[PDB]
Design a protein around this ligand. Sequence first.
Ligand code: DTP
Ligand code: DTP
Ligand code: MG
Ligand code: MG
Ligand code: NA
Lengths: 171, 171
Amino acid sequence: SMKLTIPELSLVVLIGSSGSGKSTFAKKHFKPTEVISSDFCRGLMSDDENDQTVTGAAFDVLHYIVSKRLQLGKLTVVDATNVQESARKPLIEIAKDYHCFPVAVVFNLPEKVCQERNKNRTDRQVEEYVIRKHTQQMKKSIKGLQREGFRYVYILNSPEEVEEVVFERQP
Amino acid sequence: SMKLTIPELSLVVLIGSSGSGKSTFAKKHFKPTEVISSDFCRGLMSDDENDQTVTGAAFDVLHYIVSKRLQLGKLTVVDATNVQESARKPLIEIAKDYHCFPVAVVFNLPEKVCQERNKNRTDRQVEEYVIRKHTQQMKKSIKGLQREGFRYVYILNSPEEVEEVVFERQP
Ligand SMILES: Nc1ncnc2c1ncn2[C@H]1C[C@H](O)[C@@H](COP(=O)(O)OP(=O)(O)OP(=O)(O)O)O1
Ligand SMILES: Nc1ncnc2c1ncn2[C@H]1C[C@H](O)[C@@H](COP(=O)(O)OP(=O)(O)OP(=O)(O)O)O1
Ligand SMILES: [Mg+2]
Ligand SMILES: [Mg+2]
Ligand code: NA
């Protein structure tokens, strides 16, 4: 197993393209209420599925909910693409403000893997250019993550490594 | 500052080319007794600085000294180049055997920075080809370190980042 150590009070930031398996991973490894997804926050603003017209509001709500959970000392996982630096920075700042370790878990999978899983999704799907872009952004992000403020940086380089993951929480 | 978290009982493996500043870094951050260097272990086998028959035995001696330290629950830093997988493999196994976290600290510095320090060294120097080879090996090593068994992988990408390091011994 790939043992990934996280402190009992952490902000776990999932980083990966649409289709990289973040929400699948989150559900496998964490309790439902520990996981806050951008999709869930969008659904609070709109009964339409994946409504793109409320994106700004959805992410504001995500930040707010995350900050309130950390305030109460509760480990939180952020389930969003997080491939842009502008997306990760507020999470880092929130974590620092609540004296919580931000942790990066990166889904460094080949583009083709996400493109392939995308075409077979039942919930929703995106165009191929979106996953190409997401994958480029993710790859560009990897080097600078520690410097951005992530205390622990876990890069998963293949589906097998993702599968093998086991989290060890330390209090 | 770049805060790098290490458990109280860790095997810290320095990874970097000759000239990358490993020994200097080890001296700044750790106690002299905590640090076991390949140069020291060679010295135990020969006063002759240019002996290559000694290398195997000196690595055996280093592994054993590290083993006995970790068995005694004493944090140990391996000050050797460690740019080859065959050199890291026994270190990881040793850490695992004494239920210690192996930590990788990688001096991901440009070849030219290492070559220049080496030129300016007054204690002992290596040939330029050695540093060219180390740097390529260090670079090829980065991606696989987590998979090799390192529990925390810390990549230092510039002299400034190296200089900014603060170790935090919490877990
Ligand atoms: N390890 C896996 N092996 C095979 N299929 C997988 C794996 N993980 C996820 N999938 C499938 C489930 C889905 O149909 C599809 C996308 O997974 P999902 O977890 O929704 O990605 P995601 O949450 O990263 O995308 P988005 O960012 O669009 O929410 O891939
Ligand atoms: N951060 C730094 N800034 C400027 N000069 C440095 C720095 N670190 C080391 N040096 C200089 C001092 C030494 O004369 C020279 C080599 O450093 P040293 O710590 O001996 O490297 P090393 O331990 O990685 O080499 P080797 O693997 O050959 O033992 O470089
Ligand atoms: Mg998802
Ligand atoms: Mg040295
Ligand atoms: Na130093």
